[PDB]
Amino acid sequence: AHMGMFTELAILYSKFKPQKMREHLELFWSRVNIPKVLRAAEQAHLWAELVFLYDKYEEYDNAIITMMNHPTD
Amino acid sequence: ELDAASKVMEQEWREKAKKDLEEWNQRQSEQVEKNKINNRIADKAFYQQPDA
Numbered sequence A: 001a002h003m004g005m006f007t008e009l010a011i012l013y014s015k016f017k018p019q020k021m022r023e024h025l026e027l028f029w030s031r032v033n034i035p036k037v038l039r040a041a042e043q044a045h046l047w048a049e050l051v052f053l054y055d056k057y058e059e060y061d062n063a064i065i066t067m068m069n070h071p072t073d
Numbered sequence B: 001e002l003d004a005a006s007k008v009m010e011q012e013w014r015e016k017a018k019k020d021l022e023e024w025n026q027r028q029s030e031q032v033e034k035n036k037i038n039n040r041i042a043d044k045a046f047y048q049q050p051d052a
Helices: A003-016 A018-031 A034-043 A047-056 A060-069 B002-045
Strands: none
Touching: A003 A018, A003 A034, A018 A047, A034 A047, A047 A060
C-alpha cells in the first residue's frame, strides 16, 4: 500500500466523484503526494479540501491565502 | 455554476456586512448623542447660586 496508489486514487476521485474525495482524504492524508493532490483540488475547485490539506500539512500561509481567495466557500 | 454561486454568496455577504456596519454606526451615533445629552445635563447641573 504505497503512497502512489492513494495519490492516484485522490487524483482520479476529483474528476468524477468529488463528494467522496474529502472523505478519502480525511482517511489517507498521510499517504497522498502533496503537490499532485493540491493541483487536483485546485483544478476541481475544492477549496475546502485545499484548506483541510494545508491545515493537516501545517501550511498555514497557503491555507490563509486560499481562504481569503474564497471568503464564502 | 459553482463559481457563480460563490460570487452570489460573496455579494450577499458583502450586503450583510454593509448592513451590519451601518447598524453598528447608527448605534454608536445614538450612544454618542446620549453621552452629549448627559454632558449637557451635567453642564446644566453646574448652575449654582454662589456669591459674586
